[PDB]
Symmetry: C3
Subunit: 491 residues, 3 copies
């Protein structure tokens, strides 16, 4: 009657979410946000990276100049996309260390080609084949020059091309392995012999090996492809007596952020920074479980399919009914703040949100969101992470490196979220405790702690009086005489 009650409390919601902390495997909080990206739209967005869709062509087919790849001449990319349907449709070939040539062209990001005038005096140039049709005519790789005898002579070639440019030159060349001794003589006028391609700093010698291989598009012969990089001030020398598939010039070789990806995802007219083989993915979240193959500003790949970051305090049911405070009890009816006051006095029972404490909690949570959301880092050309052939040692190491990396990031992600969630529970608990302590200090000897998050105020404390406490302007001296008389009375 001659007293009032003031309770300190916090909000609660009817639909909380479970998160993990250091203390609890499962604790319900008022709200959380997902930190693992697990979906893609399923398309690769054509912006803001320059995409080159290989369609039916591998990068190596586009490099050599398979007729169906003619439209790729001189093009550049940030990301070359190779399709599973891609197929070769020219003379059958192989590339010793195919993976390396693919990688180095991919990383260079350009098919720019400059023709050069080699001196092929004494031989027939521009050999063609029915296995490599261009506009329904017998043809050959656009960037290569099939040399054969002239008037049944093939004089020894000893041909030079200096690099007088200020940039490196990439030369692609080949050796023809004929199916039979008959074809060797028919083509090069004499028995097969080695090809030597050299510079001041390197030498490569290749021996043609005559023999039938299983027919590919009806051809039992093969071309083996080689490459040579020539520095400024160095000189290419080509030395051969037959079987040379000659370069027509050089590719520019650049450095930058280009790569290549295997994917069947359609290319869309849209804008997304992070590309995976499954399609582009949003990069707001710090982690993702879509694909360990990525290009661009991407979330880091982890094994988890979900990691929930708490964005609110512990969610605690309201106890069924006298008003009561935060001790084992949240307030579902408090909707305009996270913390606040309930009172009972001469004028009724009321509630008010505390703005300061609410904002302190929200600001800290927004702070950690700002550290974690929209802060992905870019990666470009990396290592391959899926393999179509069995290879042993090198592949074992590539796979182990990647597995090692993923487990370490998955661990970091698990620990980070547990630590942050513990900190969020701690900081939100702390704001409640601080509010209660501040109030206790204001009240001095005029109130007692009832043990339920409420004070029994031992004087008449009307709406303005309660407001003075909430506003931090309550003068304990004004009421102390009244309060002491009420507290320390014999009953």
């Amino acid at each position: 009657n001659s007293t009032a009650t003031l309770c300190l409390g916090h909000h609660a919601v009817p639909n909380g979410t479970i998160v993990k902390t250091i203390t609890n495997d499962q604790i319900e909080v008022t709200n959380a946000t997902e930190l693992v990206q697990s979906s893609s739209t399923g398309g690769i967005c054509d912006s803001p990276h320059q995409i080159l869709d290989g369609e039916n062509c591998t990068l190596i087919d586009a490099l050599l100049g398979d007729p169906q790849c003619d439209g790729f001449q001189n093009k550049k990319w940030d990301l070359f996309v190779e399709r599973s349907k891609a197929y070769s449709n020219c003379y059958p070939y192989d590339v010793p260390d195919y993976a390396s040539l693919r990688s180095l062209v991919a990383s260079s990001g350009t098919l720019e080609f400059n023709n050069e005038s080699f001196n092929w005096t004494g031989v027939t140039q521009n050999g063609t084949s029915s296995a490599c049709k261009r506009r329904s005519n017998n043809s050959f790789f656009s960037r290569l020059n099939w040399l054969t005898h002239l008037k049944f002579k093939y004089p020894a070639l000893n041909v030079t091309m200096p690099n007088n440019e200020k940039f490196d030159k990439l030369y692609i060349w080949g050796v023809h392995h004929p199916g039979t001794d008959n074809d060797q003589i028919s083509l090069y006028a004499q028995a097969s012999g080695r090809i030597t391609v050299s510079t001041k700093r390197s030498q490569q010698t290749v021996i043609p090996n005559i023999g039938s291989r299983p027919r590919v598009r009806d051809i039992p012969s093969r071309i083996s492809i080689y490459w040579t990089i020539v520095k400024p001030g160095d000189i290419l020398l080509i030395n051969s007596t037959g079987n040379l598939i000659a370069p027509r010039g050089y590719f520019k070789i650049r450095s930058g952020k280009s790569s290549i990806m295997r994917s069947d995802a359609p290319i869309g007219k849209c804008n997304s920074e992070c590309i995976t083989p499954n399609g582009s993915i949003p990069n707001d979240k710090p982690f993702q479980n879509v694909n360990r193959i990525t290009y661009g500003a991407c979330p880091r790949y982890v094994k988890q399919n979900t990691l929930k970051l708490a964005t609110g305090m512990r969610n605690v049911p309201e106890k069924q009914t006298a008003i009561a405070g935060f001790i084992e009890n949240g307030w579902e009816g408090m909707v305009d703040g996270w913390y606040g006051f309930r009172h009972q006095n001469s004028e009724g029972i009321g509630q008010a949100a505390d703005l300061k404490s609410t904002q302190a909690a929200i600001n800290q949570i927004n702070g950690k969101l700002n550290r974690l959301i929209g802060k992905t880092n870019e990666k470009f050309h990396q290592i391959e992470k899926e393999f179509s052939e069995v290879e042993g040692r090198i592949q074992d190491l590539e796979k182990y490196v990647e597995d090692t990396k993923i487990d370490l990031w998955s661990y970091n992600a698990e620990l980070l979220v547990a630590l942050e969630n513990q900190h969020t529970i701690d900081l939100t608990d702390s704001e409640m405790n601080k509010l209660f302590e501040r109030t206790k200090k204001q009240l001095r000897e005029n109130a007692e702690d009832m043990g339920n998050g409420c004070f029994k105020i031992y004087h008449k404390c009307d709406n303005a009086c309660i407001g003075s406490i909430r506003n931090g302007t309550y003068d304990h001296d004004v009421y102390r005489d009244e309060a002491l008389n009420n507290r320390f009375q014999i009953k």
Copy 2:
């Protein structure tokens, strides 16, 4: 006389253990558990993984079919164990990229072999040697076919074997390098010439090189071993004019969780999930310092030989003697709880454990144990981590990858244990503080804090009264008049 004392406290033990936290390099707690496995039984348990003990045979010798390895035909394994005593006892051979063939067969996990009928018309089959005895008779590798001239002719071989199966085929074949020109002619009727083994997608040409090597089991010649994998719908073509050591068929090549390990540990009849070269190790702990080479569900390798996880609160000696509470003081005599009450009243001096607070602490500690104990993850075929030969670049990278991984896990382990131990000290301190605070709130104006973890209760508080406080049913109003009179009296 007209008062009582109620002290809040916690247990202590005479034999505490030192752990590390974020705050302290060394702090004594009541109990701890070891998180680094540092011993092995010294034997490899034959369950639950399928173990194949190579005995005197390497995997490659068992593959080729060295007579002493005949018992291995067609066997499978999860883990092939190669012994240091193993030795070859057939024709001397080498394998270019031995490590890769070993790895790929190891990972495949099967020696299943299917014979095929190759057409070797025109040559003598089944050549043998005194260097490869089988049942005291001259013999040869079981899976290989040594072809030699027939009637002093060796017609050119051009032999095909299509893969019309729905699975890949692994072919193992070889080239014989004779010791002398005499042996070349004696065996193959003509001067040495290249061997070409091809498919639609690959080609391998090998040149026999005649010459003496140092004698091995009295043989100066050598066989070099090669392999070819043939896909469904592809075709093996073998083309040769001498020196061919032919396949008799193909190996199945499978994918799964198989590997190979070098170890001299005996195989025992027992059951253990984690295998190391030192023997099987228990996998209850999250870390281990036994060996960085592992197979199965294993603790992670770290450099530390011990990491102790606190499983109890700070251990604090009892001060020598009036009762006293937890302030700089533990209770060795409290044995039925971790926290509790001591009192002095009209009826004597008593102690009671507080079950709730004790269980809260124990449950949280059991929670972190459940996260850390018995939760190891499986790894299977990885990379090699010990090397018998000097190799340079590739080996440097294999070693660096592993060193990198171990240092990162060792760091994670060190930080994890420090963080968890800090949290355990914090949570156990917290339960003590909470118990004291709850009691303070119950007592209201009827008691004062004596500063030593005890309350001076300013009314007669008999055994039932004390029990009411411990049980949370104490009604402060019943005693308030008495208590206020005693507290606020002029003396």
Copy 3:
């Protein structure tokens, strides 16, 4: 008048430093220390590691014995330093897998060479060239022996060298590729043919390839360099009919902590444990941003250029003026302690530092400094991390491994510093709170909390009385009657 005031507080400084914690991106503390080393002196200190400055010689040139490298014979190193100005000045050569031979010699750490007496009966030894002058005379690599015909005969060589030592032998040898058929005959009396160098466990066959390469120091021919390691109990066999560049003996091959580094930094007479290409760096700090290439006891490379570790409490401005305590308020005038007391009584206004709380904070901060400062770990030979040529697959993997490692350490560093800084703020806040709580408990019913970190003491409390509180010897009973009368009076 009949009362006193006692305030609890902590120091503040006029020049605080901003650090990052888990709670705050930016919080000012009284002091911090830098954990990332970002400068070098710019010189490589010649102590305590044994440094070998290659000057104009690569390690491989010093190994082969280019005349300008004669002074390097038989020398050892912990770190061989290769200079960008280095150049070859003998016969032009290449080394297939140059990187591996460089690495394995580097890691071995010795050029110790033992001559052996090979039986080269039937040929001319010690061939020389004007391209390799020694003391103005035609010469050749010191460790190699250029064999040519004798009286226009080159008999087949078949030469043996057993390893009867208890250590491994490293043999370096070569093949001469002549510029023309004329030179082949002039030098070796017959058409070129293979060289085979073998042991019981290995074989290497190399084919000389006649032809012009672009002239290097006027020479169109080349030597290709090979190596063979021979175990105890094994035997080297060299078999050749021309073009052999023979070994004169063997190199010791050792194991230990040696490496090689590319750097143009001058060598100084000074002592530093950590070497980078930029020069030696101090190793007090746990991290560094100078270079990811390191040798010795070095801080770990991270991407951050600064990480500041808090070494003091939150720095909080003093509020402008009655004395006041720590609530939103630090004391710039407290200079002999971190925490303490201010009082107002009958005898004036005074301040005293609290030694215990100050020392508790300082000891804990010194503890974490001792864990982090001067505790670097040693690494020696690793992998290469900069590349002068484009190579593809292997280089992609080397770069990815290193990028992976650096990002993981950079993450660990960021989290470590945030966690430690949070802990430092927490522990320093805690000492303040504990001091306030201890004081509150001493005062019992004789004082009230004014809400600003101060107590109103309700009795006359002169300088000695205040001292008794600070010293922990205050007897509340002495003053309780006076204090209760003053507190609970009607006004």
